[PDB]
Design a protein around this ligand. Structure first.
Ligand SMILES: C[C@](O)(CO)[C@H](O)COP(=O)(O)OP(=O)(O)OC[C@H]1O[C@@H](n2ccc(N)nc2=O)[C@H](O)[C@@H]1O
Ligand SMILES: C[C@](O)(CO)[C@H](O)COP(=O)(O)OP(=O)(O)OC[C@H]1O[C@@H](n2ccc(N)nc2=O)[C@H](O)[C@@H]1O
Ligand SMILES: [Cl-]
Ligand SMILES: [Cl-]
Ligand SMILES: [Cl-]
Ligand SMILES: [Cl-]
Ligand SMILES: [Mg+2]
Ligand SMILES: [Mg+2]
Lengths: 218, 218
């Protein structure tokens, strides 16, 4: 069975705010997108990579990546982007992996694929939450504190049988998903977790960038 | 009105996994506990600090901190520790509870939560948006579902309260809480959030130490 990894890299980088769309920021001489793609390939369990980038950077993305990946244009939000990439299509398994998780260890990638090959139809890597999490309303008032031990922070790559992912993305007009496993949960698919990895952290803030720099220079 | 800050520093260090109780880990020449206490005092809005440490390190803590703080022994869990520290108040208008593990917390954040208490909010916690999607997961690693990320916040410290409200909440709790606001919520108190700060991250894993080093050495 073949495994295709889709890499959403079409965001604007508006929150990190380092003056360029995040995927194209050069971390110690390599863009996040190149690093993320290399990690997927180094896992030894990914056969094809499809990267989705801002429409005005498709040429740039090919210049960077060469034959490491197929390049397509992404969309106005992460969900839209994944949907466009999915259009490219049939492999047995599909991974969806944030370019922003550029330092993900290849072994995590392999761990996700192994769980798919173990027969889990949908797989996400998770970590325990360091912070207490609270539900908060629009006025800054706390609604309550869900039990932390019952919650997990979820990373990527998220892995799926291709059939299930396709059906999930095909199927709430006013939602609204922050990851891919959400669509699978929505249509009733069972999602299994595996242990994530601190190194698969998402480069989100300038502190995350500081840490990524310390890791790669270290 | 006086402000006393309670610093839970009595954890075992088992999770951090570097062969020392975490509060006594020396980050670039200063223990997390010394750094955390100095941060509180630097804020200009904390009048008294009470630190709670493992029972066999009370002498060591005093030797380290000197008259920057009163030292007491903590307990078997974080709630127990805070409870023991509260008995020392056997009077201030406000009380902050601050993790020694959030050693790089900016003094301005401490001042921000005190400002809110003085603005009339009886219970105040600093918060940040979530970076990762969060999922509810059962004991078998099966995902139960994904709550809307935008409706949730990661909570930091210092958490601030009117002294009466906190004391009453702990008294009634003494009849698993991962923070102090949760006890206030449990008896019906209302908690307001303020914006936290990425620098007030809790040093929890080895990767966190890597980031702490990059910050203090920068
Ligand atoms: C999938 C998870 O990693 C699971 O925790 C998160 O929910 C992702 O949360 P998020 O807020 O979408 O994180 P971001 O850092 O802003 O973007 C994650 C990845 O989605 C890509 N993304 C962003 C929006 C857009 N119009 N198209 C994209 O393909 C970004 O380039 C980035 O590489
Ligand atoms: C209060 C919050 O920071 C809000 O997000 C978290 O919920 C705290 O979560 P936590 O799992 O208790 O995090 P930890 O890093 O293990 O400990 C937080 C602080 O509580 C202190 N600690 C924990 C156990 C205990 N027996 N005595 C305590 O004084 C630790 O020394 C540490 O300085
Ligand atoms: Cl982005
Ligand atoms: Cl961003
Ligand atoms: Cl600890
Ligand atoms: Cl621990
Ligand atoms: Mg985004
Ligand atoms: Mg603990």
């Amino acid at each position: 069975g073949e495994v295709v990894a889709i890499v959403p890299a079409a965001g604007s980088g508006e929150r990190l705010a380092v003056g360029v769309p995040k995927a194209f920021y050069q971390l110690d001489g390599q863009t996040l997108i190149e690093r993320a793609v290399d990690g997927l390939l180094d896992s030894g369990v990914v056969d094809t990579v499809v990267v989705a980038v801002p429409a005005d950077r498709t040429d740039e993305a090919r210049q960077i990546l060469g034959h490491r990946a197929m390049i397509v244009a992404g969309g106005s939000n992460r969900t839209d982007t994944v949907n466009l990439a999915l259009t490219v299509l049939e492999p047995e398994f599909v991974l969806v992996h944030d370019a922003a998780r550029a330092l993900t260890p290849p072994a995590l990638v392999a761990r996700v694929v192994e769980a798919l090959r173990d027969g889990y139809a949908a797989v996400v890597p998770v970590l325990p939450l360091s912070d207490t999490i609270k539900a908060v309303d629009a006025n800054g008032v706390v609604l309550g504190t869900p039990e932390r031990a019952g919650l997990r922070a979820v990373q990527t790559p998220q892995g799926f049988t291709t059939d299930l992912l396709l059906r999930s993305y095909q199927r709430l007009p006013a939602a609204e998903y922050t990851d891919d496993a959400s669509l699978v949960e929505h249509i009733g698919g069972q999602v299994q977790v595996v242990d994530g990895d601190p190194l698969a952290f998402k480069i989100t803030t300038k502190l995350d960038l500081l840490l990524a720099q310390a890791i790669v220079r270290g």
